[PDB]
Design a protein around this ligand. Sequence first.
Ligand SMILES: *[C@@H]1O[C@H](CO)[C@@H](O[C@@H]2O[C@H](CO)[C@@H](O)[C@H](O)[C@H]2NC(C)=O)[C@H](O)[C@H]1NC(C)=O
Ligand SMILES: *[C@@H]1O[C@H](CO)[C@@H](O[C@@H]2O[C@H](CO)[C@@H](O)[C@H](O)[C@H]2NC(C)=O)[C@H](O)[C@H]1NC(C)=O
Ligand SMILES: *[C@@H]1O[C@H](CO)[C@@H](O[C@@H]2O[C@H](CO)[C@@H](O)[C@H](O)[C@H]2NC(C)=O)[C@H](O)[C@H]1NC(C)=O
Ligand SMILES: *[C@@H]1O[C@H](CO)[C@@H](O)[C@H](O)[C@H]1NC(C)=O
Ligand SMILES: *[C@@H]1O[C@H](CO)[C@@H](O)[C@H](O)[C@H]1NC(C)=O
Ligand SMILES: *[C@@H]1O[C@H](CO)[C@@H](O)[C@H](O)[C@H]1NC(C)=O
Lengths: 353, 353, 353
Amino acid sequence: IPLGVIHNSALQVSDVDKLVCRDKLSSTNQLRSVGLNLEGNGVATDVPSVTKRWGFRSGVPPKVVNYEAGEWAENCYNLEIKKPDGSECLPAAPDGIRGFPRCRYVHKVSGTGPCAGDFAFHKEGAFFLYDRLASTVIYRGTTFAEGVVAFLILPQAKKDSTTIRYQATGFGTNETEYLFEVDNLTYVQLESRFTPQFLLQLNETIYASGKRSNTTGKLIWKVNPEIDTAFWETEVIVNAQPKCNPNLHYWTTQDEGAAIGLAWIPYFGPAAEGIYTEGLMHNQDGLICGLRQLANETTQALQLFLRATPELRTFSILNRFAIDFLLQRWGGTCHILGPDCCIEPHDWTKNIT
Amino acid sequence: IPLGVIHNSALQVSDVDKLVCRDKLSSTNQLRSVGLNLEGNGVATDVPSVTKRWGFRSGVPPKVVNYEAGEWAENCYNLEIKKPDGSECLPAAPDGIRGFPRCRYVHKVSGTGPCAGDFAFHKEGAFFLYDRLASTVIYRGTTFAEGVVAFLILPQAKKDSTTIRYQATGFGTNETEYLFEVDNLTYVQLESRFTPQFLLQLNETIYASGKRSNTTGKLIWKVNPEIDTAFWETEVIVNAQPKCNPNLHYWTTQDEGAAIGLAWIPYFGPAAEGIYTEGLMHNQDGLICGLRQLANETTQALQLFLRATPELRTFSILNRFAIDFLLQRWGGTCHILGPDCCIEPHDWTKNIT
Amino acid sequence: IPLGVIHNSALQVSDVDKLVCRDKLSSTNQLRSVGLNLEGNGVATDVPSVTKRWGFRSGVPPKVVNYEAGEWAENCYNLEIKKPDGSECLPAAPDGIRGFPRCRYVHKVSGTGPCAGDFAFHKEGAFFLYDRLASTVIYRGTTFAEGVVAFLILPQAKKDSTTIRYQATGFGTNETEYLFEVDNLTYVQLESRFTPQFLLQLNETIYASGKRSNTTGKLIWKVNPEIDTAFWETEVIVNAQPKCNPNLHYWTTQDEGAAIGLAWIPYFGPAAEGIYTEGLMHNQDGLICGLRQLANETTQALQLFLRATPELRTFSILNRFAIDFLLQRWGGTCHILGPDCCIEPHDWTKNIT
Ligand SMILES: *[C@@H]1O[C@H](CO)[C@@H](O[C@@H]2O[C@H](CO)[C@@H](O)[C@H](O)[C@H]2NC(C)=O)[C@H](O)[C@H]1NC(C)=O
Ligand SMILES: *[C@@H]1O[C@H](CO)[C@@H](O[C@@H]2O[C@H](CO)[C@@H](O)[C@H](O)[C@H]2NC(C)=O)[C@H](O)[C@H]1NC(C)=O
Ligand SMILES: *[C@@H]1O[C@H](CO)[C@@H](O[C@@H]2O[C@H](CO)[C@@H](O)[C@H](O)[C@H]2NC(C)=O)[C@H](O)[C@H]1NC(C)=O
Ligand SMILES: *[C@@H]1O[C@H](CO)[C@@H](O)[C@H](O)[C@H]1NC(C)=O
Ligand SMILES: *[C@@H]1O[C@H](CO)[C@@H](O)[C@H](O)[C@H]1NC(C)=O
Ligand SMILES: *[C@@H]1O[C@H](CO)[C@@H](O)[C@H](O)[C@H]1NC(C)=O
């Protein structure tokens, strides 16, 4: 698992032999795990194109890991897919796995498909980000964000919703048909070019202009091609992605003794949604574009690490880093003045003279 | 999370900047987590007053942590509360969560209430202590003890039931009615002044004097006010609690290779109740009163730490301490003779001379 | 928990006071947990004799630990035992616990017994090895291997199926009757001397010679005593076992970034069975016989460690080792030239002269 460290004002990857003695890890707080969205690299976010990145596969057990800080997503998805015989396709959310906390637009899709498989994975290796838990599968009726997780050592200086409903037929094949749900009886034929802002503006006009359907009669509108329709614009890490959102609007959870006046008490504290801290990080020293690349480059080593462990949810990756960090330099006999012994005796000399 | 360390024969709190080089942590056994009961500070233990410390609240996910050593409790509670429509109020105990192992009096309460909430928390932030697991909620039909957990580094020198049934109506409100269950048809109106020894002595007299009810007819006695009715008497930590039980009768589990003659084998070993070691610690160096205060002062930092993690049961707090302990002193370049480098070279000098 | 370390080309046990400064632990990869089968020591593997090593017991909660590397087993077992009233005896396999990955012969036994107990443990203290998880109980319909787990520090130089069906009556008593299932209606009276190769050769002759039973009529053959019938032949660790299989054909899971050409992606990667690496270790330096003894000598300290923890599945034993390893030498003030300070200053002297 690659580990991000900042040297020469640059984000770099190294763990095994880059024993830079100068690097200081004096607390576990400097260790962070970040879940960056695939949106930041420019992937398409429309429902038709996105669902082609997912597929069902059996014989592979699901794996879950935790991450501390996430990213505000403009798009999220919540699937309620069933088989044509009425059997659900996706498993219910396991205990403690809630939806992604921050989503501008929630694409809730309902429909049918063959579902030739127990679990639905990502065809590109990315994760499904949830509430501080990334999983390799999709859970039924749970809002998720497509993303990947990076791992960082922070320098000691400063260490830190609208629901859109769809209908689907033949989910998960080459021949799928989607319908934008205006209400229970008014539907619009979806296209790959329809943006979220376009679906909502279209929704306001159908409701206001009185173009809703009958009480039972199903009416399916269509939009002709002549109707006109990234989001944020409208070894050294090298970002080789299509685009990069140079700013990171992140979410995390804070802890401190003052607790904003007696709010620790769970009975009086916030709900599952108001526990988060927020911040805006800019691309000073090019960390944001680098970090998005780091999380992509980390995915391959992290997917195999979760394959090999029989643990359902892994929480010990950051602890295992700090242990390895101490074992590399102090795990053997420290030969003073040797390359592998970070002990400095220059202050002492002067007393001998 | 505050960490208790003994300096100048006194229990003290510090972790971040109190790098006392002299302090020796040479094994993980010196790290201990203690669950001290709220009884030790003098809180009232009668069923009517205690149930006002509990309340139902939704939208907050429950959190559980483990502790190694507990405290013998004179009072414990086991709730079997249902809603007036017949729907249970408390969730069933999750896998592996058993009752508190040591209780002199078990207050098993049965009855009804509105239960305006999924889980029932502690209105003061304390935990619900179970079998080496502290939870923030109450489980159905599981004996628990109200307590809090402290964290300690031990010096290297020496590093170490009667069921009372009640009936309730309107559980968890300002207007509740309790009944002391003599048998299935004989009941006594409860008061806040009735002690456990008083309920048992009263029980013996009702049975013996032949004052039991009919075969179906429900009879509810009452005790007039003219009937006369703590338990153990009948930055530096500063105990600011009402009272302090200066002695700690603790329970813990031991491990050693001799195993008392082939008892390790689970098929032949003890049951879930006879695995415990016991001991009696006195207030030498004022550690017991200090420790009860430490566990109270720890509660606030520990409640938020469990809010921020998506882990249902946290077992890694003690490991995370020992990692931080090594990172504070050896996590950077050790400058010999510097304040932050616990390396002593005085023995070597003499050879140079 | 004893820890295996190689000194003077010999496998040795020590952790607490054997602070050999020379020993180097520079990465968590040098830490390994091995699950060795009881076959390697020569225990009988026939179904009748083996089932007498198992027994039911209540009041003892089950415990599970993980191990990294296992051992190819010639014999495994898969029980589907029920009570005479139709109630199952064994609990269903918990989430993520699959069968033992490598088994030459799978003894699938079906039948009835009194099952005077909730869980079935090992009467000798050994574990039930599953897919990188060892448990103290038997799960229903899950293939397991009887084994024990050892713990090792590797030197930095180089750090690394046929189903046989049975029928049973009175399972788990002194009076049990077993039947070798040829098909649903042809059965052979089992004996302790019948080897797996003998049951399969017998199966081929009954099928070929046309000695199968009627369509409903149950026929039970018997083999007279005049019919003639180890497997691999047909403080310092001292192997005091009956036999020792001096070679270890192990299985483990590998992780590396190359991933054999885009196989990390779970949707495209292997199934739950093709994730394993294999290797053959010989008894160079007598490590294999020693290791089998180490895993036996470890069992007693590991069984009590799992009794004391309230954790269902323990994954932190190897991390706890590396933490203790750093705390023993760096957990206190390092007095240069002292016996307990692994710091070498000989290189520096020459500059002073
Ligand atoms: C990380 O970036 C790479 C860039 O190559 C992404 O690779 C894509 O992989 C799929 C199949 O796996 C191809 O069909 C695409 O053409 C590749 N490029 C792009 C731009 O999509 C990869 O999906 C990214 N995410 C990871 C590895 O999790
Ligand atoms: C720790 O001790 C404090 C002492 O102030 C306890 O604080 C009580 O808090 C409740 C409301 O939270 C008040 O109504 C009480 O008057 C306070 N004092 C007492 C003596 O009860 C606190 O409950 C204790 N336990 C913790 C913090 O877990
Ligand atoms: C480890 O080896 C010992 C060798 O003594 C095994 O001990 C057996 O224990 C049972 C009862 O516990 C006795 O009936 C046997 O006679 C003992 N010897 C043999 C050769 O079976 C022990 O079972 C082994 N496994 C462990 C401890 O897990
Ligand atoms: C569409 O508009 C109606 C009323 O204006 C509103 O109730 C509904 O939530 C809207 N749908 C979406 C997807 O915004
Ligand atoms: C009350 O006394 C009876 C008989 O003396 C006994 O069976 C019962 O358990 C007692 N109840 C309590 C709460 O001690
Ligand atoms: C016995 O032989 C038959 C056919 O030869 C085969 O179908 C069956 O699986 C065999 N049984 C075993 C236990 O090998």
